[PDB]
């Protein structure tokens, strides 16, 4: 019935002795920056304790005063209040206990489901594994999209940027990439920076409706929260993702707006009076994103055996990142977009003109690129994606002739309809991720010519019906392809026989 009687006893097992504490006094308070007088032993990055259980971080250790930023609300602090060193750097809870929970930038639970039971803590700011401890990226990360998984493949330990204007599917593509991991073995992390609280709740409600929440850690730093918390949230989420990588496992992290993290870091810098550069950003804004993104990596078996002290052996761990950036009117030459495009392994560009023309996934395959390429693909998709590339390239070259197709030469007229049918195949729906076998049916059907008698307007119902047919009469072949995405003469003949039988009766 009651609980209060068995908890008080523990409180009577806590130290009451005096402890030496280095202390200062608040001299000025403004815009979220408290300037303190004293604290001669505070370290750059150490956390300061203010009256009321409020904490700060020291960022300007000048000769005569300390410039500190509040990791919470600063409107209750005042001149003459006492400030105390803690002797600690910023650390967050880490481990499997965070899966299926919503937390703030400091790891406190905000979902209301109860206290987290994490068995360890780790530092938010850490260095990335050095050059010699890494392993080449050669394992796939399926996003469930035919346009991305076939032409812009993402591998385990890669950093792929999602870039484009406002309201064109950037968030949808990254959330669907998280939903597709519920059965894969990859743990997922979603970091929300500067978003409104009701938007973050619609993504979590959608992760829960699709069964992906139990495999995801949600880190939130909403638009009303301190710029210091919005600046630190990506590093906190990265630290939670690094637990699985350093212990021999695989993780995926989404930074929903690195451009909002840059805006929060600019606010703190101009208020500390640091010298400004282009677009008023501080001189180390490149180092801000680079220090974060170089942690997303694949580490060798020797690093995992060294870290685990022998416990885990023979396994290589990884952290894959999907940072998101918003462009203004397609201007990729802006300062922050230019920095991140140069740091990442590849870019997925979404376009407003394609999105308004009904091409829902909006991926501009003509400029999007993955430097890892075919090494991040299974054998079946690597074999069927080669012709898809040639057909879309031919369509981009001969697309004005669509209105003069009659006057076109037969060879060219054949290429033009193939290009238009492969282009219509790339269109997909939200919250509908496709498996390696199901993507292979669609890519195989187009690449082997099975759409030449299908009106460009019926290509989609043809795809949807073909998958539903194979799910019922060829369940064993789909299960076989889904083991490793393998390909051979028996699978090729098996898929062909099923598509020919489909056309003969359905």
């Amino acid at each position: 019935s009651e609980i209060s009687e068995i908890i008080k006893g523990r409180i009577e097992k806590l130290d009451v002795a005096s402890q030496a504490r280095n202390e200062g006094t608040i001299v000025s308070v403004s815009d979220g920056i408290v300037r303190i007088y004293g604290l001669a032993d505070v370290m750059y990055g150490e956390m300061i304790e203010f009256p009321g259980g409020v904490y700060g971080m020291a960022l300007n250790l000048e000769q005569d005063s300390v410039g500190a930023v509040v990791l919470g609300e600063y409107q209750g602090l005042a001149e003459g209040m006492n400030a105390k060193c803690t002797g600690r750097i910023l650390e967050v809870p880490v481990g499997p206990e965070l899966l299926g929970r919503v937390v703030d930038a400091l790891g406190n639970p905000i979902d209301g489901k109860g206290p987290i039971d994490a068995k360890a803590t780790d530092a938010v700011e850490k260095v990335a594994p050095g050059v010699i401890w890494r392993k080449s990226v050669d394992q796939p990360v399926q996003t469930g999209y035919k346009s991305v998984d076939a032409m812009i493949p993402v591998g385990r330990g890669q950093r792929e940027l999602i870039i484009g204007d406002r309201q064109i599917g950037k968030t949808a593509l990254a959330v669907d990439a998280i939903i597709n991991q519920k059965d894969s073995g990859i743990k997922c992390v979603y970091v929300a920076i500067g978003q409104k609280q009701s938007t973050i709740a619609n993504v979590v409600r959608k992760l829960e409706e699709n069964g992906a929440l139990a495999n995801t850690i949600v880190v939130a730093a909403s638009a009303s929260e301190s710029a210091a918390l919005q600046y630190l949230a990506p590093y906190s989420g990265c630290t939670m993702g690094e637990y699985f990588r350093d212990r021999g496992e695989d993780a995926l992290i989404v930074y929903d707006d690195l451009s909002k993290q840059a805006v929060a870091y600019r606010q703190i810098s101009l208020l500390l009076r640091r010298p400004p550069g282009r677009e008023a950003y501080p001189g180390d804004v490149f180092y801000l994103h680079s220090r974060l993104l170089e942690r997303a990596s694949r580490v060798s078996e020797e690093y995992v055996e060294k870290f685990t002290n022998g416990a885990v052996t023979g396994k290589t761990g990884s952290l894959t990142a999907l940072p998101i950036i918003e462009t203004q009117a397609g201007d990729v030459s802006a300062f922050v977009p230019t920095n991140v495009i140069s740091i990442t392994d590849g870019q997925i560009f979404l376009e407003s003109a394609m999105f308004n023309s009904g091409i829902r996934p909006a991926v501009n395959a003509g400029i999007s690129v993955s430097r890892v390429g075919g090494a991040a693909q299974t054998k079946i998709i690597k074999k069927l994606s080669g012709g898809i590339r040639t057909a879309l390239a031919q369509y981009r070259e001969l697309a004005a002739f669509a209105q003069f197709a009659s006057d076109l030469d037969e060879a060219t007229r054949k290429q033009l309809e193939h290009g238009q049918r492969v282009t219509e195949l790339m269109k997909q729906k939200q919250y509908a991720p496709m498996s390696i076998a199901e993507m292979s049916l669609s890519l195989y059907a187009a690449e082997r010519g099975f759409l030449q008698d299908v009106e460009i307007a019926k290509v989609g119902s043809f795809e949807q019906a073909l998958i539903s047919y194979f799910q019922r009469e060829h369940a064993a072949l789909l299960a076989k392809i889904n083991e490793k995405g393998d390909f051979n003469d028996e699978i090729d003949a098996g898929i062909k026989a099923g598509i020919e039988k489909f056309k003969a009766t359905q």
């Binding site: 406002r166 009701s198 709740a201 009076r273 203004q328």
Partner: protein, 456 residues
């Protein structure tokens, strides 16, 4: 204790207090003799606070004694505020004497927690064809009317107020922020003459008022709406221009000792906006439905202020100067406007297909327009010639005469139900009305009228 004015520069005032009696951030101060209120914004140090005047400083002098009130601006809240016009300090700015308040709240407050947010998709009908089609509003959702100067933000909001607030059974708050004093007078007489003033609280801070007034008027109106939401009621909150809140911060930011950021804006643009926008929400106690008009400096949607605003709203309605320059109203851009309720799982496949169908036709025509200018129409293929006709008609069929615009249009106002909105556009896309001249769809409410206008 008591303080002395030490430095007056424009709207910003420094007040020095005993080092043991320094007033808190956002605390309200009163000048002795002069009727002026100052809000502490920063504690410079040595007992001095930096504050902004909530009035004029022409009568202020150095050495005037200032009094600490021990709290932030406290405005009257509840039933006593209905049918009254008030300033930023909550004083009545109508001749109806004092307000019988039974409680005062502080304008500064925390945003509702992550566990207090509530999700709903109840569809709200507006009666406008373009909005009901591409920007379906939802009860308890956040709407934004984005646009430059002279394209219809006030007019469209007034039409919505008329098509929603008048029927709305609950209460309503109207906040005029940096508005023209003439619009405030016309709206007050309009609510009074329509007998709806009894269920509407009016807070006004026009362009003739000091920066501090235009910087806190939005918090005053929102504080009154929050009292009603927390009573378990359903409320409507209309803000005339929320840009004036950002601009008042830009006007005062440099005098507050802050270095400027990109496009000469305060370095606190995104946080000052988030602190206001996160309070305008529908929690688990009651629901605030809100419509905000958002000014776009020089018609550039990439300007930091408009660009930072989109992420805070559920429905984004975009007004275009190029459409208004062709005599077309409402000048909503169907290819730039968006809504979260636009989802087959929220509304239906028939509505969604009609909306995407209209957008597809208008997106393709945006590229043929230049092709027709150079060369000629003859050089197009028949499918392009046929598409160009439907696009020009759909563009015109999006135009609807509004009752609030009769003074300008000269014609009577019209109200179109979403059913008629869907039916008409579907027919035009099918090509059923390809027998009608292009001029018949301009300002014709329902498609039926278009069939009648073609005969005149």
């Amino acid at each position: 204790s008591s303080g002395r004015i030490v430095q007056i520069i424009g709207a910003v005032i420094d007040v020095e207090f005993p080092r043991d009696a320094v007033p808190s951030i956002y605390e309200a101060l009163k000048v002795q003799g002069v009727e002026t209120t100052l809000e502490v914004q920063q504690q410079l140090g040595d007992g001095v606070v930096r504050s902004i005047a909530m009035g004029s400083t022409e009568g202020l002098k150095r050495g005037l004694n200032v009094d600490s009130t021990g709290a932030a601006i406290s405005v009257p809240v509840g039933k006593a505020t209905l049918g009254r016009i008030m300033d930023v300090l909550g004083n009545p700015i109508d001749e109806a004497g004092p307000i019988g308040e039974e409680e005062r709240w502080g304008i500064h407050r925390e945003a509702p927690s992550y566990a207090d947010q509530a999700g709903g998709n109840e569809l709200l009908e507006t009666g406008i064809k373009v909005i009901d089609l591409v920007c379906p509003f939802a009860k308890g959702g956040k709407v934004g009317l984005f646009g430059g100067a002279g394209v219809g933000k006030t007019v469209n909001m007034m039409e919505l107020i008329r098509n929603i607030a008048i029927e709305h059974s609950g209460y309503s708050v109207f906040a005029g922020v940096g508005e023209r004093t003439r619009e405030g007078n016309d709206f007050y007489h309009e609510m009074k003459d329509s007998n709806v003033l009894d269920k509407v609280a009016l807070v006004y801070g026009q362009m003739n008022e000091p920066p501090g007034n235009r910087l806190r008027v939005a918090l005053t109106g929102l504080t009154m709406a929050e009292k009603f939401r927390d009573e378990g009621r359903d409320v409507l909150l209309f803000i005339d221009n929320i840009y004036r809140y950002t601009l008042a911060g830009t006007e005062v930011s440099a005098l507050l000792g802050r270095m400027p950021s990109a496009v000469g804006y305060q370095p606190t643009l995104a946080e000052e906006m988030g602190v206001l926008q996160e309070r305008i929400t529908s929690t688990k106690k009651g629901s605030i439905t809100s419509i905000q008009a958002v000014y776009v400096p020089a018609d550039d949607l990439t300007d930091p202020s408009p660009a930072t605003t989109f992420a805070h709203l559920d429905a984004t309605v975009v007004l275009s100067r190029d459409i208004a320059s062709l005599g077309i109203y409402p000048a909503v851009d169907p290819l730039d406007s968006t809504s979260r309720q636009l989802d087959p799982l929220v509304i239906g496949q028939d509505h969604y297909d009609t909306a995407r169908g209209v957008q597809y036709v208008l997106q393709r025509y945006k590229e043929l327009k230049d092709i027709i200018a150079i060369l000629g129409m003859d050089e197009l293929s028949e499918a392009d010639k046929l598409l160009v006709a439907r696009a020009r008609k759909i563009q015109r069929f999006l135009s609807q005469p509004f009752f609030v615009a009769e003074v300008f249009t000269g014609s009577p106002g019209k109200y179109v139900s979403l059913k008629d909105t869907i039916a008409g556009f579907k027919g035009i896309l099918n090509g059923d009305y390809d027998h009608l001249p292009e001029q018949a769809f301009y300002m014709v409410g329902g498609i039926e009228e278009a069939v009648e206008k073609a005969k005149k």
